[PDB]
Short mmCIF file of C-alpha atoms in Angstrom, two decimals:
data_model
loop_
_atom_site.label_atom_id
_atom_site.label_comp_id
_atom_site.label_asym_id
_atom_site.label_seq_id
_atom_site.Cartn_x
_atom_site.Cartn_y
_atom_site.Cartn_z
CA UNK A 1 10.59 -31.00 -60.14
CA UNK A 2 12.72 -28.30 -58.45
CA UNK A 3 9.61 -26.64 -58.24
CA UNK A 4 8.44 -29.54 -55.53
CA UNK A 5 11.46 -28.90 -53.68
CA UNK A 6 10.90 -25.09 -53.06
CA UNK A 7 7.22 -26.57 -52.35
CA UNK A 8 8.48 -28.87 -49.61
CA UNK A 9 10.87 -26.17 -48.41
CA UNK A 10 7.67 -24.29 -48.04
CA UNK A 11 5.42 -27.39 -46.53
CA UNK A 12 8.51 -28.08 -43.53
CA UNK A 13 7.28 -24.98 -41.36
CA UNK A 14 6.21 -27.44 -38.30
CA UNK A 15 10.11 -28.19 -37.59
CA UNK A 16 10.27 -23.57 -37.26
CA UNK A 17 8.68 -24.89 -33.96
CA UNK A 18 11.62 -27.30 -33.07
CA UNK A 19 13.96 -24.56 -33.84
CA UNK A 20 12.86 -22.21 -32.32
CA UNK A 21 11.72 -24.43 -28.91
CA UNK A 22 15.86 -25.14 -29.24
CA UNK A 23 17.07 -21.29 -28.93
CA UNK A 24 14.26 -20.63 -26.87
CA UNK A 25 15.06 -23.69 -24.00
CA UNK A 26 18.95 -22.79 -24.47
CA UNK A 27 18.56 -19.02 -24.48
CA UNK A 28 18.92 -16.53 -21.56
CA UNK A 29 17.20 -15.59 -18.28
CA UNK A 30 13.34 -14.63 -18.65
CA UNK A 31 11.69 -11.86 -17.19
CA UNK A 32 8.72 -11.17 -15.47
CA UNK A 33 9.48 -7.50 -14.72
CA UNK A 34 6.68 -5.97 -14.22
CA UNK A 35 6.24 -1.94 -12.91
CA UNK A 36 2.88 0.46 -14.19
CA UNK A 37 3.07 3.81 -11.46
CA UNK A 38 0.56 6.67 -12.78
CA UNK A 39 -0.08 10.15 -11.07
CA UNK A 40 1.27 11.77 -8.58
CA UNK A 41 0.20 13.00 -5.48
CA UNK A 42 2.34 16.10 -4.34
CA UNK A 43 1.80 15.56 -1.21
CA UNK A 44 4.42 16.85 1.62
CA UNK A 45 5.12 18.03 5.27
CA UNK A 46 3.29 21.60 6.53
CA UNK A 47 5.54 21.98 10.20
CA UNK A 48 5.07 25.58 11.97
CA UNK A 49 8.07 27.05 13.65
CA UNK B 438 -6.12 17.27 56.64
CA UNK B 439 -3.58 16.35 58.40
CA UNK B 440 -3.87 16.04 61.71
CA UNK B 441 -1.33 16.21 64.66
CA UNK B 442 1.04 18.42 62.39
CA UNK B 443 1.86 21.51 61.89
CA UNK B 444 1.98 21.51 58.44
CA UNK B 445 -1.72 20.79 57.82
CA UNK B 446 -4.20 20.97 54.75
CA UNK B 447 -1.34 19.59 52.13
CA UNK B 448 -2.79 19.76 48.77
CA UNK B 449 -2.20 17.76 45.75
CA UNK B 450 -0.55 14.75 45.46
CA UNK B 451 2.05 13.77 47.61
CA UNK B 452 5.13 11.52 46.46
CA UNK B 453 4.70 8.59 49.07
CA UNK B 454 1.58 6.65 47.74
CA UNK B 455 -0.98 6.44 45.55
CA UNK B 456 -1.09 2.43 45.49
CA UNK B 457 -3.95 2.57 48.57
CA UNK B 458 -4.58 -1.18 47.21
CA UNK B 459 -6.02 0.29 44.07
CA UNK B 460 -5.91 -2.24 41.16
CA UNK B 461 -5.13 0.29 38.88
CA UNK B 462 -5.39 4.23 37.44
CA UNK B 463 -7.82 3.60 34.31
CA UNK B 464 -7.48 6.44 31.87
CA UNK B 465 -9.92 5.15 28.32
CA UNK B 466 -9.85 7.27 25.07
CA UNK B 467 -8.74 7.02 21.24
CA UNK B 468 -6.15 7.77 19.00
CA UNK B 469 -6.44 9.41 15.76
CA UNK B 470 -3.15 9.47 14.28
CA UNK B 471 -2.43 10.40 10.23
CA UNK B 472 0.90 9.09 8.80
CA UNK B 473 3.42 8.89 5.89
CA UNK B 474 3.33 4.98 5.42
CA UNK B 475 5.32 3.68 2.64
CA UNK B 476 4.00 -0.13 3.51
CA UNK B 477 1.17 0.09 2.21
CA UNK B 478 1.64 -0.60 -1.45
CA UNK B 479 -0.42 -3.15 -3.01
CA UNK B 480 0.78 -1.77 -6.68
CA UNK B 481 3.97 -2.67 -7.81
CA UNK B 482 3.11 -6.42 -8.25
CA UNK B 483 4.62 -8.59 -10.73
CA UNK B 484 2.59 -10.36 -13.54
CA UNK B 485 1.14 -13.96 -12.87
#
């Protein structure tokens, strides 16, 4: 009775998709930043006077 | 030499000419050279 309602409130989750398509298409900016730098080298500059 | 001067047996190079219808004074060799480069970064590159 009820019971098939909260079971076809459960069955609906291939309209999540829709909604979430919706924010997704209308939402902000997306970013492909994208930056990984490891060691070091401590390298530098050996001048004589 | 020089000749009919008094000023004789000038050595070195002079400043009037050293054209003489040479082509050209040809000196060959290499470089070695080691330098800071910040150009050559083939790291920070985005995704896709």
């Amino acid at each position: 009775m009820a019971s098939l309602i909260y079971r076809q409130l459960l069955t609906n989750s291939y309209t999540v998709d829709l909604s979430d398509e919706i924010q997704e298409i209308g939402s902000t900016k997306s970013q492909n930043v994208t930056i990984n730098p490891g060691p070091f080298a401590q390298t530098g500059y050996a001048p004589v006077n | 030499k020089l000749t009919r001067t008094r000023l004789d047996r000038l050595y070195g190079l002079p400043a009037a000419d050293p054209n003489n219808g040479k082509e050209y004074y040809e000196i060959a060799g290499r470089f070695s050279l080691i330098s800071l480069v910040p150009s050559n970064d083939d790291y920070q590159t985005p995704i896709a």
